[PDB]
Amino acid sequence: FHVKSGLQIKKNAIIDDYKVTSQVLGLGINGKVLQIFNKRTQEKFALKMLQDCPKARREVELHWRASQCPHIVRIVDVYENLYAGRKCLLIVMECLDGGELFSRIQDRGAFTEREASEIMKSIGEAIQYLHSINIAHRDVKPENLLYTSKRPNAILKLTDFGFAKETTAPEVLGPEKYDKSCDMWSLGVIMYILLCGYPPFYSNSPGMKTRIRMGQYEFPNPEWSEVSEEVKMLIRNLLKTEPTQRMTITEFMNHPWIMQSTKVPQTPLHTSRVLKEDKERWE
Ligand SMILES: O=C1NCCc2[nH]c(-c3ccnc(-c4cnc5ccccc5c4)c3)cc21
C-alpha cells in the first residue's frame, strides 16, 4: 500500500525564497530554464517559467506525477505567481549541472559497448516508469538527457514534459494510440548514436524525411565493424517504421543486451572520437 504526496502549489512570491538570476541553462518546448539559488541555503536549482494556461497545468501535472522516478528530473516546488499582470507557473527543479549526455561522452581521452548498454538501460528505466503510469514522453532526445553532476557516478535524468501526454485483453481495458511507440523510436535513435557517434538518419534534407519514412539506414564500417549482430537486431526492432511492429518498453527492458549490462563486452566504440570530430554539424 504505497501512496506519495500530492502537489502543493506555493503562492508566495517566489523571490521570498530564491535569488533569481538570468543565466540560461536550457530551452524548453515552452519556457527557458534559468539558474537560481535558494536564498536560505546558497544551493543551486533550475527554474522553468510557464504562462499558466492548461497546456502548462498539464506539464506540471504529468511531470509531478513522474517525478518519483530516479531517472526523471525531480521537481522541488511549484509556484503560482503574478508576473507582469499575467499568472505564472514557476517550476523549481533540482539542478542537473553534469551536462547533457552526449557531452559528457564527447569529453574524454574511449566509450565501451558496455557503457552504452548501461546508459541505454537508465534511459529505458525512465521510459518504463512513464509508460507504466500511462505517460508518453513524446520528446526523448539527447538535449533532454542531463547528468546530475560531473562526478563520474552521477545519474542520468530525463527532462522536459512539454509534450508529455496521458494515454487513456489489454486492448479492451482501454484503447490507446501509438503515443508510446513514439518513445521507443527515440530510444532506438539514441541507442544508435550511442554506439557510433552519428544518427541513423542523415541530412546532406527532403531526402532525410524520406529515408526516415522508408527506414533507410545502414550499420556502416568501421564504426560498427565491432558491434554485435544481437545489438543491431535490437536497434532494428526499435527503428521499425510501423509503430505497431515496434518493440515495447517492456520487451526492451527484458532484452538481454539491456537486462544484463555487465554481461556485455567492454568492446570500444568510435563514439567519442566521432562526436568531437563532428561537433560542427552536430546542430
Ligand atoms: O524541462 C526542460 N526542457 C528543456 C531542457 C531543460 N533543461 C532543464 C534543466 C533542468 C535542470 N538542470 C539543468 C541544467 C543545470 N545545470 C547545467 C549546467 C551545465 C549545462 C547544463 C545544465 C543544465 C537543466 C530542464 C529542461
Side-chain angles (χ1 to χ4, degrees), residues 1-282:
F1 191 78
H2 252 59
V3 29
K4 298 289 182 186
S5 141
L7 181 60
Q8 183 60 84
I9 302 303
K10 286 198 166 41
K11 316 283 183 84
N12 50 293
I14 185 192
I15 55 213
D16 297 357
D17 291 352
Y18 304 90
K19 170 111 186 143
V20 188
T21 94
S22 66
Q23 160 164 108
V24 175
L25 270 206
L27 281 113
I29 100 84
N30 48 209
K32 10 152 198 190
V33 181
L34 318 187
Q35 177 98 74
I36 72 170
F37 306 85
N38 179 165
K39 283 173 159 182
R40 190 187 40 100
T41 257
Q42 272 328 267
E43 189 184 17
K44 37 207 296 193
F45 288 98
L47 168 111
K48 176 184 245 209
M49 309 196 25
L50 324 160
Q51 185 176 172
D52 178 279
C53 60
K55 269 269 182 180
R57 288 282 176 170
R58 162 145 71 226
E59 191 176 327
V60 170
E61 233 303 273
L62 292 173
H63 187 166
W64 174 258
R65 206 122 79 55
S67 172
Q68 294 188 40
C69 180
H71 285 282
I72 291 194
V73 57
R74 184 180 91 251
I75 283 172
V76 171
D77 265 333
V78 176
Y79 294 77
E80 174 190 297
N81 285 176
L82 268 178
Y83 179 49
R86 272 192 293 202
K87 201 220 285 237
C88 283
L89 250 14
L90 321 191
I91 308 181
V92 164
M93 42 202 112
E94 81 193 304
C95 181
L96 304 171
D97 42 67
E100 344 193 316
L101 167 81
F102 281 137
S103 293
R104 294 268 265 40
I105 296 273
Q106 165 184 173
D107 279 56
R108 284 155 93 93
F111 187 48
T112 72
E113 184 180 318
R114 170 176 311 170
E115 302 184 63
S117 164
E118 312 197 307
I119 307 186
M120 280 316 301
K121 177 161 166 203
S122 22
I123 310 208
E125 298 198 347
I127 306 291
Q128 147 150 78
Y129 180 63
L130 281 176
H131 284 178
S132 71
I133 71 183
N134 291 106
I135 304 191
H137 178 108
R138 300 253 252 71
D139 194 48
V140 172
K141 36 171 149 67
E143 310 79 274
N144 279 150
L145 294 159
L146 305 194
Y147 272 110
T148 60
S149 84
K150 266 129 186 164
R151 302 154 87 230
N153 46 54
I155 314 279
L156 195 58
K157 300 202 176 185
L158 178 55
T159 56
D160 203 13
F161 287 65
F163 293 68
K165 166 170 175 152
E166 281 226 46
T167 49
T168 53
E171 0 117 27
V172 151
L173 316 190
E176 189 145 21
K177 302 295 192 172
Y178 324 116
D179 269 321
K180 300 198 206 163
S181 68
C182 205
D183 295 332
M184 302 308 296
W185 169 277
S186 302
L187 216 79
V189 179
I190 286 178
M191 183 187 301
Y192 184 91
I193 299 180
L194 259 200
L195 283 174
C196 79
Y198 46 91
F201 299 114
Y202 254 151
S203 187
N204 283 344
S205 192
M208 189 195 82
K209 246 160 150 196
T210 3
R211 289 195 290 287
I212 281 180
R213 320 178 61 91
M214 294 280 277
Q216 303 196 358
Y217 54 89
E218 291 178 44
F219 300 111
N221 292 307
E223 282 95 21
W224 294 87
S225 19
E226 215 125 71
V227 179
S228 143
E229 172 71 1
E230 181 205 36
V231 169
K232 300 183 193 181
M233 203 41 53
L234 180 51
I235 308 237
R236 264 195 274 265
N237 274 83
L238 293 176
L239 297 178
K240 287 261 183 223
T241 51
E242 178 51 42
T244 119
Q245 242 186 291
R246 210 173 291 149
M247 186 177 283
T248 84
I249 187 60
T250 287
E251 318 186 300
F252 178 88
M253 284 310 265
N254 273 307
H255 184 300
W257 190 77
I258 294 302
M259 262 259 309
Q260 272 147 249
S261 319
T262 52
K263 297 255 189 190
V264 168
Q266 302 248 190
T267 123
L269 320 328
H270 293 52
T271 290
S272 204
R273 185 158 56 235
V274 194
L275 232 16
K276 287 139 163 164
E277 207 171 300
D278 221 348
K279 206 175 179 190
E280 288 240 313
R281 79 106 190 279
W282 190 236

